[PDB]
Amino acid sequence: IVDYRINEEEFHKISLLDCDFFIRKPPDPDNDVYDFREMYVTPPDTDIYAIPRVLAPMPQKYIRCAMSDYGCYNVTEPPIDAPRDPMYKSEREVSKVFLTKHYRNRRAGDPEFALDFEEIYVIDSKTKSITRAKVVVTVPGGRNRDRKNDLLVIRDNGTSFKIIPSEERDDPTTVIEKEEWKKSRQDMERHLRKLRDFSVSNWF
């Protein structure tokens, strides 16, 4: 416990399902600048401040970044006790936040805006930790590859990051279909294993 109560007017507040994360805010016109030097984490909507677990090297200078949320919608049917009581309840439930460096600390307005996907930092709700991602650039072009034809694909619960060229992206149906095929195949085999003739059979 820090033992001092901070002024939160000077801190960015990011809210996750189980925690609130505070990072320092240097003044700027569009509110995009971040200091990773001071950070605190708090139980949800309560005000006893505490120091986060930092699992990686953190930046020592001001960085312009963009924030995104990762999570799952929860739709529940709640009990009905009055005539017009709500039939359904929906909650966002964010679990991780990804902060990505603007390129060369450039600003949105500039014609030259892009995002540096090499530097992405993650905040995790369950572990109260901040870490840096490991990206695998499979895009030829080297370190100098253009940043106007780059796309990042995140898979695996936020644990896999890759940069690939734009045109080689998969359509939305293919991603769903690929997954269903894998699961369905494994499940049929599990069923059919019990039969005494499995060793002598062929998938077709």
Binding site: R132, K134, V136, V137, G142
Partner: peptide, 8 residues
């Protein structure tokens, strides 16, 4: 140059 963080 490159950290463990970025791999090509």
């Amino acid at each position: 140059l490159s950290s463990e963080y970025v791999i090509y």
